[PDB]
């Protein structure tokens, strides 16, 4: 029943010596929550100030104990006492006092379900507001990539709880400097050294975080120590990624025996700039130029002509001739039937209209300075229902770049493997109809690029390398808004290649309905698990009525096997015959499904599935049945 448990420390009194701490618990409606059985002060701490343990040294949380002893006051308030407060006799009323309060997920007596809740609050030594803090990050940055409300590795769900246990005192006591949170946190996302008894190399963490300080260190008016990432250089933290320096021995660096002089040479401006220089320069390059793309069908030849207008940062026309020698690639992929693409991967129209400053002979720049390209593949417009009246064209492009500048592509044969030599630019999408009626467009209301950008950043150059320019997904290809009038950046353009017939092979589950699920259930399950909300605002179950067969397997002879579309969509994570699927192939067929059959059988059965008679999936609970 309870969706969110709010916790406030409303009162701290030292009038009896050891503090009495009152917590007030409210639900999402701000109603008092009575009967909490698993409330605890997980840690009582006080803040040793910046520099007190030595010149250049970090502020530290000194341990004062913990408590599970509390009275339920029957009004939403709970009052803690400490049986053994400050066992080390270090309590100092001149220091900031911190309390880390946790409520374990569980159930009240009446059976009301209660979610986990965690918080910290800081005070002075009399229970008033604090005079100074160590507020550098907030839990929210972790939720960008780790499912909110789930434990991150172990122990807790919020970074402040991690910080309250993984203290300098904790690390010193175990003779393990590396388990201090300010070392650990960088260590577990950086592949320069392994961590844990089993020496995990953080290959995946490294691939996502890419040492980008700004995914966790965010400037914030609520966090007065947010600039500590550049302002407090110490061998203890800087060594977490810089693993080959021995400061003591002067190996990899001049000898340093303490943190006294780090800041004298490692000025905040330099530390901040050097660690963010390349992502900032790339983002600046991406935002220099745009494209505006149109498509028309010649009603007699039934070929689409795509026109690309380059524009500058202010939406002002740039003649493509003026920048052609710096255009590394421009690719146009055209498919048909945006709700159920009809040409497959092999049948799609595709061209590198530009490669390393050279126009393909099939592409021209007109006197208006636009690129013009006409499809050559049969688009089969109108040959598969009303949806097949619409051709949709995905434009991806890249410009040659070195050290934050656009450069001439000096090498015609440059293969696009070295991604330091070019920038993927903003991709576009253009619709055209044979009939001259308004085009169909695919739904974009269930998943969008904002979800992707949480883990991959808004500057994600998708497929950048030898095969592709790299697609940057922006409002350039938005054709609808959400309830609040924000432009939706959909992945509808991706269907040009991620077709119901799959991609280059019938074996890859290349259909967009399957591919993102396949990739992320295999490689991102530690981050996502069953958390559909990581990509989905909702499920568009109505879209299934516009789908046909979906490619789900390759037969022995390399030909395509297909499933009815709901079965195909669910089976990506619930493989038939595996421990992840209770329904046998026979049972799925009894519910109207075709499972890895012919395209004709799957197509004929595509609207015969009874799955949604029983299954009532929501993003909150996709497992829900009658
Ligand atoms: C929109 C819903 C998303 C798109 C489009 C993509 N993702 Fe992800 N993703 C994540 C991890 C941890 C990996 C594996 C990294 C690794 O193995 O090193 C991936 C992988 C991809 C890939 C493959 C190419 C690449 O690694 O860059 C593509 C093309 C891709 N993803 C596109 C993490 C996340 C994540 C965090 C919880 C979210 C919300 C998404 N990905 C969503 C999308
Ligand atoms: C996306 C840009 C991330 C942000 C922001 C944070 N983390 Fe992360 N983390 C991320 C990835 C891709 C990985 C590798 C996961 C894997 O499956 O290998 C991790 C790893 C961790 C770990 C290690 C335990 C493990 O999952 O292997 C911990 C303890 C961890 N992350 C914690 C963490 C905290 C506390 C964050 C907020 C400060 C945080 N992460 C941000 C991706 C991202
Ligand atoms: C105490 C109440 C803890 C809280 C809260 C968190 N962690 Fe922890 N962690 C704790 C101990 C006692 C240990 C073992 C230390 C040792 O002697 O080896 C750990 C270990 C980790 C590790 C492994 C680190 C390494 O081996 O280098 C990770 C990655 C880790 N802890 C992460 C972590 C995160 C993200 C937390 C907040 C959600 C967190 N821990 C809280 C004790 C405590
Ligand atoms: C999330 C995965 C992070 C990324 C990426 C980086 N940092 Fe970080 N940093 C993070 C946390 C959760 C903490 C602990 C905050 C606390 O309250 O204890 C830190 C701490 C630092 C510090 C220490 C500051 C101090 O007062 O001693 C420094 C100097 C620091 N981080 C630097 C840093 C740099 C240079 C990064 C990019 C290369 C960077 N961090 C990434 C979480 C994350
Ligand atoms: C991992 C998250 C890191 C932490 C924590 C710190 N640094 Fe770093 N540093 C990191 C990378 C990936 C790079 C290369 C950046 C690039 O694009 O070139 C760096 C680079 C430096 C440099 C540049 C010169 C050199 O020889 O590397 C300096 C002077 C440097 N880093 C200093 C530094 C200090 C003082 C840190 C603690 C505050 C620090 N780094 C943390 C990755 C990470
Ligand atoms: C001036 C006399 C310095 C003092 C004192 C410290 N460092 Fe340093 N450091 C300095 C220079 C000129 C360089 C090379 C810069 C470059 O761009 O090449 C460095 C390098 C580092 C690095 C990065 C090493 C690498 O990437 O290979 C780190 C992490 C670093 N320094 C940290 C650091 C700390 C923590 C210090 C106090 C203990 C410290 N340095 C002192 C110049 C000076
Ligand atoms: C044709 C020019 C393509 C366009 C446009 C897009 N993708 Fe793609 N993708 C393509 C191929 C040939 C492959 C390999 C075969 C396969 O089916 O896996 C892929 C692969 C992916 C993957 C899997 C992981 C990877 O190999 O990178 C994902 C998650 C993926 N593609 C996503 C994707 C998105 C979101 C697109 C629109 C921005 C997109 N692709 C366009 C071919 C083509
Ligand atoms: C990001 C990595 C994703 C996660 C995590 C989940 N889904 Fe997804 N889903 C994703 C994409 C890119 C698409 C394709 C949209 C398109 O235009 O075809 C989908 C599609 C679905 C569908 C089809 C209906 C629709 O809304 O388009 C269903 C029924 C669906 N997804 C279910 C689903 C469930 C149950 C998940 C949690 C276990 C889940 N998805 C996670 C991307 C991602
Ligand atoms: C991967 C992105 C998934 C897609 C697509 C779908 N499901 Fe799923 N489901 C997934 C996971 C990781 C889990 C948890 C498994 C575990 O035990 O941890 C589930 C679970 C279900 C369940 C409950 C388990 C059971 O035995 O019944 C149901 C009923 C379920 N899933 C249904 C379902 C349907 C109908 C889907 C298509 C609309 C579907 N799932 C897609 C991961 C993914
Ligand atoms: C009612 C008679 C059902 C019809 C029709 C279909 N399914 Fe089902 N499904 C049903 C139940 C009662 C369960 C188990 C629920 C639980 O939580 O244990 C399921 C389970 C699934 C799952 C999860 C499988 C697993 O994790 O082992 C999936 C992916 C699933 N069902 C898909 C599905 C499809 C695609 C259907 C149409 C062909 C379909 N189900 C019909 C009940 C019923
Ligand atoms: Ca308070
Ligand atoms: Ca909280
Ligand atoms: Ca590491
Ligand atoms: Ca456009
Ligand atoms: Ca029907």
Author numbering: 45 to 670
From the paper:
Bacterial multiheme cytochromes (MHCs) attract much attention for their contributions to extracellular electron transfer whereby electrons are exchanged across the cell boundary and consequently between internal enzymes and external redox partners. These processes evolved to allow the capture of electrons for anabolic reactions and the release of electrons from internal oxidation during anaerobic respiration. Thus, we investigated whether amber suppression in MR-1 could produce ncAA-containing MHCs and, specifically, variants of the MtrC protein, which contains ten c-type hemes. MtrC is found on the outer surface of MR-1 cells. MR-1 cells typically present MtrC tightly bound to the external face of the outer membrane spanning the MtrAB porin-cytochrome complex.
The structure of wtMtrC was inspected to identify surface residues that might be changed to ncAAs with limited effect on the MtrC structure. Residue A293 in Domain II and E344 and A430 in Domain III were chosen, Figure 2C. Thus, site-specific replacement of MtrC surface residues with BocK has no discernible impact on the protein structure. By contrast, there was no detectable FMN reduction for ΔmtrC/omcA MR-1 cells cultured in the absence of wtMtrC. Cells from cultures augmented by MtrC344BocK and MtrC430BocK also displayed FMN reduction rates comparable to those of MR-1, Figure 5C. Thus, our results indicate that MtrC344BocK and MtrC430BocK retain the structure and redox activity of wtMtrC. A crystal structure of the homologous MtrCAB complex purified from Shewanella baltica OS18542 shows that MtrC Domain III, which contains residues 344 and 430, makes no contribution to the binding with MtrAB. This is consistent with the ability of wtMtrC, MtrC344BocK, and MtrC430BocK to restore FMN reduction activity to ΔmtrC/omcA MR-1 cells by associating with MtrAB in the outer membrane.
